[PDB]
Each structure stands twice: as C-alpha cells, then as structure tokens.
Amino acid sequence: LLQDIEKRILHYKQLFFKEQNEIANGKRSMVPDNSIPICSDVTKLNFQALIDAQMRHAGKMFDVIMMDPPWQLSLSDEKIQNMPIQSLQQDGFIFVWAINAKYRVTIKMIENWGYKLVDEITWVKKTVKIAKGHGFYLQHAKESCLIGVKGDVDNGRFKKNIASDVIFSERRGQSQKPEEIYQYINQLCPNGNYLEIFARRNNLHDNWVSIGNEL
Amino acid sequence: PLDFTQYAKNMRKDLSNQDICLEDGALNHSYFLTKKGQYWTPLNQKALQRGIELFGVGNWKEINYDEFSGKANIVELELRTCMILGINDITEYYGKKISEEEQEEIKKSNIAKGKKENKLKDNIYQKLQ
Numbered sequence: 607l608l609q610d611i612e613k614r615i616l617h618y619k620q621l622f623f624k625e626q627n628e629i630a631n632g633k634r635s636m637v638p639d640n641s642i643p644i645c646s647d648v649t650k651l652n653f654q655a656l657i658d659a660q661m662r663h664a665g666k667m668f669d670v671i672m673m674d675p676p677w678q679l680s681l682s683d684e685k686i687q688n689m690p691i692q693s694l695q696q697d698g699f700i701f702v703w704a705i706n707a708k709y710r711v712t713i714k715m716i717e718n719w720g721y722k723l724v725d726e727i728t729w730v731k732k733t734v735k736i737a738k739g740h741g742f743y744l745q746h747a748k749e750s751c752l753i754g755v756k757g758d759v760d761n762g763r764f765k766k767n768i769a770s771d772v773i774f775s776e777r778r779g780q781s782q783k784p785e786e787i788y789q790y791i792n793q794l795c796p797n798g799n800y801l802e803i804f805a806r807r808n809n810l811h812d813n814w815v816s817i818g819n820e821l
Numbered sequence: 822p823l824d825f826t827q828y829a830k831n832m833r834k835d836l837s838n839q840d841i842c843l844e845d846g847a848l849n850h851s852y853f854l855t856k857k858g859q860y861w862t863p864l865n866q867k868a869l870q871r872g873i874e875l876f877g878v879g880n881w882k883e884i885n886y887d888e889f890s891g892k893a894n895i896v897e898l899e900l901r902t903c904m905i906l907g908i909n910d911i912t913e914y915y916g917k918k919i920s921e922e923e924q925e926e927i928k929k930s931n932i933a934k935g936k937k938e939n940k941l942k943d944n945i946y947q948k949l950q
C-alpha cells in the first residue's frame with residue numbers, strides 16, 4: 607500500500623536524523639576508549655612502525671598476542687607463517703585459534719616463531735550444553751586456542767594458575783570468540799600491553815592494540 | 822604506573838587512519854557507529870554542500886560524479902540534504918541550486934519555523950502532507 611509505504615519512509619528518516627544528531631552531541635561508541643584500533647592488511651603492514659611506536663610510548667613489548675588467522679579454505683598459509691611475529695614480542699605469551707584443519711600446522715607455526723607450546727584452551731558451545739559440528743572423523747563440539755611462550759614469565763606481571771583451560775560461552779555472530787578470553791588474559795597478565803591480529807570490530811578492548819582490515 | 826589512555830593517543834596518531842581518531846589523538850566514535858567503509862567524512866560533507874551550490878538539490882546523478890565519484894548511496898545524499906536545509910521533506914527545494922550562504926539561512930529559517938510551530942523533532946522541521 608502506497609500510503610503504508612509512504613508512511614514508513616518518513617518514520618525511518620527520522621531515526622537517521624536522530625542518530626546523526628546524537629552523534630553530533632557526543633554519543634559514545636560501543637568501543638572502549640582505551641582500545642587502539644588500526645586498519646590495515648598485515649601483508650601490506652610494516653610492523654616496524656608499530657614496533658617503533660610501541661617501544662616509544664611503552665619502552666616495552668607485547669605481553670600477549672592473539673590470532674584467528676583467516677585460514678584459506680583466506681590469506682596464503684605461507685603469508686601468515688611469514689608475518690614478522692618474532693619481532694613483535696620478546697618475553698611473553700601468544701594465543702592462536704586453530705580450526706581442526708589447521709591444528710597441527712598452527713603448532714608448527716608457533717614453534718617456528720620460537721614459542722614453546724604449553725597449554726591449550728578449549729571452547730565449548732552451549733545450547734542454552736552441546737555443539738553440533740560436521741567433524742571429518744569425530745563431530746566437533748569445540749575449537750581451541752593454542753598458547754605458546756617465550757622468555758621469562760617468572761616475572762611479576764604474569765600470574766601462574768590464574769585461569770582455566772576450559773571456556774563455557776555461547777556463540778555470537780560466529781566467528782566470534784568468547785568474551786571470557788579477555789578476562790582469562792587478565793588473570794595471566796594484569797594490566798599489561800596486549801596485541802591482537804586479524805581483529806574484528808566487535809572484539810576491541812581497552813589497552814589492546816588491534817589490527818584487522820575490517821576496522 | 823602506565824597511563825594507558827595517553828599511550829593510546831600517540832599510537833592512534835601515527836598508526837590509525839585519519840578518520841578513526843581526532844587530531845588530539847582521541848578516538849572518534851562517529852567512525853565506529855557507522856558501518857564499513859560507509860563513514861561520512863567532514864571533508865566530503867563540505868562536498869555535498871558544495872554540490873548543491875553548483876548543481877542543485879535532486880541533481881544527485883549530476884552532483885554525484887563531480888564531488889563523490891562512485892560515490893555515495895543516492896539516498897544518503899538526499900537524507901543529508903534534508904539535514905542541511907533543516908526540513909524533513911526536501912521536495913519543496915528540488916531542482917534549485919542553493920548557495921552555502923543560503924542553505925544556512927533556509928536551515929536557520931526552517932528550524933525557527935519548526936520550533937514556534939512546535940513541530941520540529943531532532944532539530945529537523947517536520948512537514949505536513
């Protein structure tokens with residue numbers, strides 16, 4: 607009905623008129639203020655700039671790094687392996703999410719960058735308690751974060767025995783990782799520099815650098 | 822004993838795209854409420870205003886090539902123009918090229934009119950049909 611349609615359009619423009627107005631007035635972003643989004647493609651990215659600045663404003667190097675590589679089924683597998691991660695951090699943990707397809711390869715990847723595999727986080731998907739995945743040999747009801755370490759964590763900053771291997775949350779807009787990972791990272795490192803690569807807009811947090819081409 | 826908030830700025834200055842953060846180095850929530858890639862920059866706002874002065878309202882196809890090359894949803898323009906003139910029905914002004922000096926007046930005038938009429942919502946005058 608034209609009258610019905612004509613009617614909706616005016617109602618709709620009003621929202622937009624309102625939202626732009628609210629923004630004018632300072633309406634906040636969902637994003638926390640302390641987060642440091644950067645938009646680039648890593649292949650394109652020169653990590654020197656990131657290192658120079660980080661050393662410059664912290665005189666330090668990343669406590670933690672996180673990854674959800676966009677595995678090809680889509681960055682070349684070679685490209686991710688070849689990212690200059692080793693330069694990025696000197697004494698810290700690394701997290702990386704391995705789909706069951708890449709699980710071994712990922713392992714080889716962190717070891718390549720000089721990490722020692724010490725722990726794996728497991729993430730279950732709860733119906734709200736089960737996940738249906740079309741597993742090649744066994745159906746999958748989780749994916750998992752592989753954690754590697756280099757250097758001294760005997761340091762005060764990282765706290766041992768502060769987190770649980772298993773995580774329990776619902777899946778939102780997958781691929782979107784559980785919130786609680788950032789909490790668990792708080793246990794491990796309390797208020798320390800963190801990084802994240804391949805990052806989407808939703809997952810930005812305070813004190814966290816983030817690089818993705820979707821930011 | 823680190824101020825994360827300060828740390829955020831200098832990084833955001835040399836690292837983050839111009840749209841993402843303000844000159845001071847604070848992060849501008851405008852960019853982050855809008856989607857993509859769909860951000861409407863101050864500078865191309867000037868371009869809309871400039872475009873109306875040259876080609877006139879409802880000249881979007883002609884206006885579009887000159888100031889936004891692809892460049893914009895035909896709707897985003899008309900919606901934004903409704904904002905420039907301070908009305909919600911832009912039909913009245915169509916095909917008329919309006920100077921920046923005059924867009925300011927029409928907006929100023931239309932709003933005062935809305936307010937006294939008591940039919941202005943969100944700083945835009947609502948128009949009877």
Ligand SMILES: Nc1ncnc2c1ncn2[C@@H]1O[C@H](CSCC[C@H](N)C(=O)O)[C@@H](O)[C@H]1O
Pocket residue numbers: 646647648649673674675676680681781782783803804805806808809817818819820
């Ligand atoms: N060549 C490239 N360079 C940098 N980032 C890329 C890329 N190709 C894909 N990406 C990004 O890597 C991300 C993989 S998805 C990341 C999921 C995200 N961690 C979450 O919170 O769920 C996507 O943002 C994709 O945009």
